[PDB]
């Protein structure tokens, strides 16, 4: 299967509290494995997965230094950005960065990521060619010119094609079946009275991994959404996920409806009825 090494970085300015808050988190696929928080009792990079304790101290020290350099950079960039947009009322502003690599099951670099958003919207992003930049507005054209003449695209190309893929393969080796896992959902249907004319049927899928899943309701063989409620896929807290899908059906006719669960861990889709 395809895999991803991603870092999600957030920097938030704090009027009156001095230095901005800086948070960086790392994910291998759907699993967080490292963290950095400037407000911790402990501004260091630390593990968040049970298979990351086998890296030595030098790993963590290097990660920490790179983190701090990035924090410094974001400290500058927040000020720069409030200048570019002529924001005069001060206030808290947000700068986000996502970077990393998506590889195929054949370890092809599907996508190298190096992108930035300011105050909730796109600011600038490295394109898939890993050579050119996309700048969301005129302020980001300044930055784009700078990074063009400076050769940043090459700099991060080297990383995305090298270090990123390398260490992704390494993390996949360390975690192994805790990452390459496939947990089939545990599924069941519940029944809930509503009124004289209708009731609610709810299809539950619990404890599955990875997060990708699809639930469908059918009436004697054909799909419905004429009154279907579908919640967002949610983390259980133990590294697995949950989801449910409910439908309002006429009283007495509950036994005509079926739920269908589609997941990587289910060779054949599950068909359930109450």
């Amino acid at each position: 299967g395809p895999h991803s090494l991603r870092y999600f970085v957030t920097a938030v300015s704090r009027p009156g509290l001095g230095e901005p808050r800086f948070i960086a988190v790392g994910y291998v696929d759907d699993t967080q494995f490292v963290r950095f928080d400037s407000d911790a009792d402990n501004p260091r990079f630390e593990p968040r997965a049970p298979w990351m304790e086998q890296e030595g101290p030098e790993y963590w020290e290097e990660q920490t230094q790179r983190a701090k350099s990035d924090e410094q950079w974001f400290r500058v960039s927040l000020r720069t950005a409030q200048r570019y947009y002529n924001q005069s009322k001060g206030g808290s502003h947000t700068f986000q960065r996502m970077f990393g690599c998506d590889v195929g099951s054949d370890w092809r670099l599907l996508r190298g990521y190096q992108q930035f958003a300011y105050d909730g919207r796109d600011y600038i992003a490295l394109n898939e060619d890993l050579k050119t930049w996309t700048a969301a507005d005129t302020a980001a054209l300044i930055t784009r010119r700078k990074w063009e003449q400076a050769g940043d695209a090459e700099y991060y190309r080297a990383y995305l094609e090298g270090e990123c893929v390398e260490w992704l393969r390494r993390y996949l080796e360390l975690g192994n079946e805790t990452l390459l896992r496939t947990d089939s959902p545990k599924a069941h249907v519940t029944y809930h009275p509503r009124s004289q004319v209708d009731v609610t049927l709810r299809c539950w899928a619990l404890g599955f991994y990875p997060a990708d899943i699809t639930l469908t309701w059918q009436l004697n063989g054909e799909d419905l959404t004429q009154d279907m409620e579908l919640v967002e896929t949610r983390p259980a807290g133990d590294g697995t996920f949950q989801k449910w899908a409910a439908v309002v059906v006429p009283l007495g006719k509950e036994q005509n409806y079926t739920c269908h669960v589609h997941h990587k861990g289910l060779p054949e889709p599950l068909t359930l009825r109450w």
Binding site: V76, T80, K146, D152, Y155, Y159, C164
Partner: peptide, 10 residues
Amino acid sequence: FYAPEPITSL
């Protein structure tokens, strides 16, 4: 592995 230190300002 975190990306290398930035080389160009915003």
